[PDB]
């Protein structure tokens, strides 16, 4: 049609396309053509609409498994995936692993997690300035945590990192490359679960194995694919967000300075930068209206698909004052960096904990921390549904 292509542009660093501000003011629900599937979808750019699309049972993610449905990513959605489940099947699927992810149990991890951080910043003072924060902190820290929590051997890091990168592909890989990797990841994760048949374990793969035999409502696909989801998300998010928050802090170095000063403002600064950063480069897993639903400016009809831009909802000038600006002293922060509704991030407390502990340590032990490579040459990941840096050389 004359419906525009979404994404609107190749992304630049952590910058928002300014069409998002235009769309927010004048056309906050707009028709867009997603890179894969057939047809058109409504793009949702404002906080109130995002909350309805993410929040209401009249929007179904399961309805989007149809290969004809528009989507951000080459492969048609895996039907046994958590994102493709609607409540109440979705609620039952999430109860299998949720206990592990409540703010209470995630708090219980802060000791082990801080020790791990210290050990790795130790190995980085040993190598000496300048060093690559990616090599020494951003990758090994979240990989260690999700490995211990799930029960995944650390010796498999290169294996699951390669699979995980492939499956967050936007334009870098083809549908058939990604379905291939998906099959391998399923068989590998099925393999690890099966090892707990006559040898149960006190870890989440432990729980996923007991479910295969003790639970009659959940298919083995769903249970095993859950293992894949936690292992992908459990390193892919935090690894990129550490590089992203650091990039935000050391470019306008006033922010890092201001945290060196008051290191107890780090929990608030993490929430503010979570609001400010497009971790999800563009759009979202799609929701299809199953009934007419009224958004701000339009009634989406049954069968019409919708896609949200999280980073755009988190720049809504009707919700956050001075949104175009990072403020660590904000009174309220009702951001949706972790989504909303049924599919609200399960790992949100873990990712909060890992971002909190990484930035605390750095601000406290490295007050001299600065970018020891040019901003113009920064190797931002290309052709993936998420943003982050491949390398971040820092001096102290
Ligand atoms: C800074 C860290 C993180 C951010 C910004 C983040 C962001 C998000 C967002 C926006 C969603 C919603 C997707 C949607 O509804 O379309 C989500 C879902 C999810 N996140 Fe996170 N996440 C983070 C950390 C983690 C961690 C540490 C894990 C696992 C250990 C994880 C696992 C998941 C899973 C499995 C889902 C899908 C949940 C469902 O479909 O019910 N995330 N995350
Ligand atoms: C369109 C962008 C989205 O990607 C997708 O839907 C991907 C195809 C999913 O299969 C990815 C690989 C799953 O592992 C998720 C469980 C990862 C978790 C972090 C998210 O939900 C994430 C926010 C995700 O929704 C977005 C990146």
Residue numbers in the entry: 12 to 407
Lines quoted from the article behind this entry:
The 8.8a-oleandolide epoxygenase OleP, from Streptomyces antibioticus, is the P450 involved in the polyketide biosynthesis of the antibiotic oleandomycin. It introduces an epoxide function to the C8-C8a of the macrolactone ring of two structurally different intermediates, namely the aglycone 8.8a-oleandolide (DEO) and the C3-mono-glycosylated L-olivosyl-8.8a-deoxyoleandolide (L-O-DEO). Substrate binding to the cytochrome P450 OleP is coupled to a large open-to-closed transition that remodels the active site, minimizing its exposure to the external solvent. When the aglycone substrate binds, a small empty cavity is formed between the I and G helices, the BC loop, and the substrate itself, where solvent molecules accumulate mediating substrate-enzyme interactions.
The tyrosine side chain at position 89 is not located inside the cavity, but it rotates towards the bulk. In the wild type OleP, the glutamate 89 was found in a double conformation, one that exposed the residue towards the solvent (flipped-out), and one towards the polar cavity (flipped-in). Therefore, the substitution with a tyrosine stabilizes the flipped-out conformation, since we found the amino acid exposed to the solvent in all of the chains identified in the asymmetric unit. The effect of this structural change is a slight increase of the volume of the catalytic pocket with respect to the wild type, which has been measured to be 671.2 Å3. In E89Y, the rotation that orients the side chain of the residue on the opposite side to the heme binding pocket eliminates the water mediated contacts established by the E89 side chain. Moreover, in E89Y, we identified one molecule of glycerol (GOL), used to cryoprotect the formed crystal, absent in the wild type, that occupies the position of the E89 sidechain and of two water molecules. Therefore, in the presence of E89Y mutation, the effect of the stabilization of the flipped-out conformation of the residue is limited to minor structural changes within the solvent cavity: (i) A slight enlargement of the cavity; (ii) the rearrangement of Q193 on G helix that rotates about 45° in the direction of the place left by the carboxyl group at the Cδ of the glutamate side chain to compensate for its absence. In this position, Q193 indirectly contacts N236 on the I helix through GOL. Furthermore, the calculation of the solvent cavity volumes as provided by MD trajectories confirms the analysis of the crystal structure, where an increase of the E89Y cavity volume with respect to the WT and G92W has been observed. Indeed, while the effect of the ionic strength on the spin state equilibrium of the wild type and E89Y is comparable, showing the total low-to-high spin shift at I = 2.5–3 M, in G92W and S240Y mutants the shift is not complete even at the highest ionic strength conditions tested (I = 3.5 M).
